UniProtKB/Swiss-Prot annotation, chain A:
<dbReference type="GO" id="GO:0005783">
    <property type="term" value="C:endoplasmic reticulum"/>
</dbReference>
<keyword id="KW-0963">Cytoplasm</keyword>
<dbReference type="InterPro" id="IPR021131">
    <property type="entry name" value="Ribosomal_uL15/eL18"/>
</dbReference>
<keyword id="KW-0256">Endoplasmic reticulum</keyword>
<dbReference type="GO" id="GO:0022625">
    <property type="term" value="C:cytosolic large ribosomal subunit"/>
</dbReference>
<dbReference type="InterPro" id="IPR036227">
    <property type="entry name" value="Ribosomal_uL15/eL18_sf"/>
</dbReference>
<protein>
    <recommendedName>
        <fullName>Large ribosomal subunit protein uL15A</fullName>
    </recommendedName>
</protein>
<keyword id="KW-0689">Ribosomal protein</keyword>
<comment type="subunit">
    <text>Component of the large ribosomal subunit.</text>
</comment>
<dbReference type="InterPro" id="IPR030878">
    <property type="entry name" value="Ribosomal_uL15"/>
</dbReference>
<dbReference type="GO" id="GO:0003735">
    <property type="term" value="F:structural constituent of ribosome"/>
</dbReference>
<comment type="similarity">
    <text>Belongs to the universal ribosomal protein uL15 family.</text>
</comment>
<dbReference type="Pfam" id="PF00828">
    <property type="entry name" value="Ribosomal_L27A"/>
</dbReference>
<keyword id="KW-0687">Ribonucleoprotein</keyword>
<feature type="region of interest" description="Disordered">
    <location>
        <begin position="20"/>
        <end position="39"/>
    </location>
</feature>
<comment type="function">
    <text>Component of the large ribosomal subunit. The ribosome is a large ribonucleoprotein complex responsible for the synthesis of proteins in the cell.</text>
</comment>
<dbReference type="GO" id="GO:0006412">
    <property type="term" value="P:translation"/>
</dbReference>
Amino acid sequence: ATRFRQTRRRRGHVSMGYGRIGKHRKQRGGRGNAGGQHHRKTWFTTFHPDYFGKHGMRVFHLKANKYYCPSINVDSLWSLVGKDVQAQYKNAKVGEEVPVIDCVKHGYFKVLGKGFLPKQPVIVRARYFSEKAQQKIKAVGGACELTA
Amino acid sequence: GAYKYINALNRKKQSDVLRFLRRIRCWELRHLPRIHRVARPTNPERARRLGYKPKSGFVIYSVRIHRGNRKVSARKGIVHRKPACQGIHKIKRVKSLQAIAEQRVGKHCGALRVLNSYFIGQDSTYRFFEVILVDPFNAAIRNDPKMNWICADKQKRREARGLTSAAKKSRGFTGKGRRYNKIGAGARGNLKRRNLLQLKRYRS
Amino acid sequence: RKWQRKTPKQMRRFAVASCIAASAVPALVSARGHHIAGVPQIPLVVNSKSISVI
Amino acid sequence: MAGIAVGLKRGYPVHTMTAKRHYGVTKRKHVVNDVIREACGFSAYERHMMDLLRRGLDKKALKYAKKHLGTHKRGLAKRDEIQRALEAI
Amino acid sequence: AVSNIHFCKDWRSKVHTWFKQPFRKIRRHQTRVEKAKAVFPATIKSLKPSVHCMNQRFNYKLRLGRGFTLKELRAAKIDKNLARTIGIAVDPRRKESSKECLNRNAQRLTEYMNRLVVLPKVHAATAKRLVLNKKNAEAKTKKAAEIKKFIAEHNKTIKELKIKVAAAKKDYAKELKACLKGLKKAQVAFAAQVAKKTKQFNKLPVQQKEAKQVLDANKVIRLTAPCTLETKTLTKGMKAFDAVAHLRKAKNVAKAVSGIVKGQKK
RNA sequence: AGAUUUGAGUAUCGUAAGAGGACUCCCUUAACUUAAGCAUAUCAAUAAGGGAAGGAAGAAAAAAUAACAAUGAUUUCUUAAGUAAUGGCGAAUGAAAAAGAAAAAGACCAAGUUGAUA
RNA sequence: UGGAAGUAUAAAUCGAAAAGGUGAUAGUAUUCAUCAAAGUCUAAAUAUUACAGGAAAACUGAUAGCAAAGAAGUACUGUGAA
RNA sequence: AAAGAAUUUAAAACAUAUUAGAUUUAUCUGAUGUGUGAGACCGUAAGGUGAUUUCUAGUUAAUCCUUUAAUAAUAAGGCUU
């Protein structure tokens, strides 16, 4: 909407809101990130203080698929099957059927341990596990399974 | 067969037999005109591999080209350029001398089709090739289901567009894969496609 | 230039539902410029049998 | 129940299935090689390698072979190919 | 924020605008319809394998590939010279990756051949194949009389056990320990008895039927059956199994091969 | 004299040229500009100069990816992605496998064999 | 060239094979994986502001819109390119 | 010393043996064969056995990270000063 711009409100003002002493000229210190070390050094120091330099080792061809590992905490495990199933198997223990949570089938590879699990036995199947993830699953009365 | 020994023999180009015969051939081609027809290929093994068939409509032309390197054509070696482009010597052609000689033959005989070419010999000054040419309007070539692809209009001046093996090698079409990312299906077409700024109809 | 504008689907469906609801308010229907003084019901429905013969 | 995703014994349990086909020559390639070799002979660097091999400088014959071929493995094959000609004579 | 905008070149000659998009749909759809009218089983989008995706990021998913390998055609008893003529993709470039891939795509082809209805090459009722089917029809009646005696006397000890499992599971859903053990014990015995020669090629289903025209066979034969909620019985072994040390032992085994090789040469 | 090889003149039947070049395939070592100077870099396969094509052209059937529960000619679109990387590591430049679709199609020479050989 | 101890092309010199290439950090070795270069053709999906024929438009309405709504690349200028 | 079933039928690479042909060269070309490479534990008797993992005690080896199929000795790159 060009009728809501400031140009329509500054009609009649000579300088169009840019100043009489310091005019609106072509440039204001260079094109792009010019003067990163000379006159805009106070800008880069203030707002991007690690912009110039080198850090870490180069990876000539990075295989970004090798780092792909979606994670889910323990407290979020039961949301994969829903609350209806969670309450249905609420009073299970060793010996009878217990629901299996297929983390991989839902797109989660690693299971981390954060928050608190509901006090029901459960079988967790995933590719990777954390030390506290397995502790919390086992302390509730469940098991851990590997995949792939 | 006879041609499985000729091919084996022709890889020993540093033998005294082949070195002597190439000396006689290269001397003879230094006096004959630059581009001229020969009755039969001097390397029938290599000619047959590249597509030559001893039938009507196939002719062989010999072209002599001055090998080596040349200067940048600037008057008295003066260029009003920055020091990054101020080099007159040491600058190499992009097209191979085989591809350059193919265009000279094709230009000379504009009514024939350059099928392929191979290498005959070289001396301290020249390099000699032979070019397989096919007449597209021959009743024998037209009626051959395996060769009338040369009668298509798009094959007019094959070597100038860059469709022959010699001219395609200088285009980068010598392989496939991550080594040839920039020469996928045409080096200049690939650059245009990657540089296209797509502005969809409904964009944010 | 930018001719067409994007809009989220759930916002588009919100507007149609709000526009359908207003079509059943006789005050809003007439205030828009429609003569609906004589119609029996403001959510006017006709038989599917009568429609099939037209 | 599913394998494991880390280690040497890594992967989902399946029965993975190809023949390492050898690209070789026939017994007639020896006849062709001997026919061509007699009709042609040895190159300048092949002759120089024969002289070094006779004097017992195997390492210098490999360094010379690598110089004219550029590959360590191809320099070895030429050295062994030449030394099989010396034992024939 | 430091800006990185690559508009320093002539983007005005690099701008591609999509004003032809609403007419690509009409072009492609109309040509797609034109193909169906011309010869319908060409736009049929000939049958394709079920091949896994690559890399560990996707390897649990299935997707259509290109062409059935020559070993999968032999297992399904189809000639590769006839496969391309009846809407089957064939890819000799595909190496067999696993037995399970070989079995899964063998089921796909067999199921496709059952749903397939090949019309006679010549529409006349005097076609040689139609005549030949009449000639050997009486032989099929004799042969099919033996195909039914078999697979009615051999798969009978497991059928009752298989029936009992369904009934016992139905009763449980209203035991399974001994019910499933009996079926398992028979299955190993059955697998021990098969260890003998089957026809190289099956027959092409050829007949005369009213043409029901289906635009693709890939959406009829689904890649993956719908996933339900898998449920398992908790045992003491499942509780005991400590998965973290299995992960860390497996990692440390692979990272100690350097130490093994270094210590050998010393 | 005769048998061949090679090279010419003439005759017959045809072939190339020139126009156009928006899109297509290429040859060539521009500079203005940016870097608040400037000399590598950027502008930039960009301007101009030159050649060759068709209704489309280019490419196309792995000496290809990957390290997987693995794929499988080419082309084009989405995403990867302003990411890996390149760079007075400054200004700036910058892909591709995977994955999702449109369309789908594979065949030949050379070499080898058959030679009362055609 | 994004390709970094060399991704591609070309030139000078050199130059293989009882094969071999690739796995992008140079080197040697042993395994593994995957292909089999140095000849050719191949429709479909794709591009288009030459030009011709059409249809549309929140476009301009005679100092606007093509330079040109009339015998417009016309009248007129230049030796000429223009 | 303490807990520990391990998932379930369509298969090819060839390390080979043993034969049917051809060859002399740096020799090859078919087929038959076992293992390899295989994984359904014995229970209606409580459940034992048993791969594989844990803790403690000596032993020999490696040990800052990377060169993206796995290692090695050279080389190169990272991190701190």
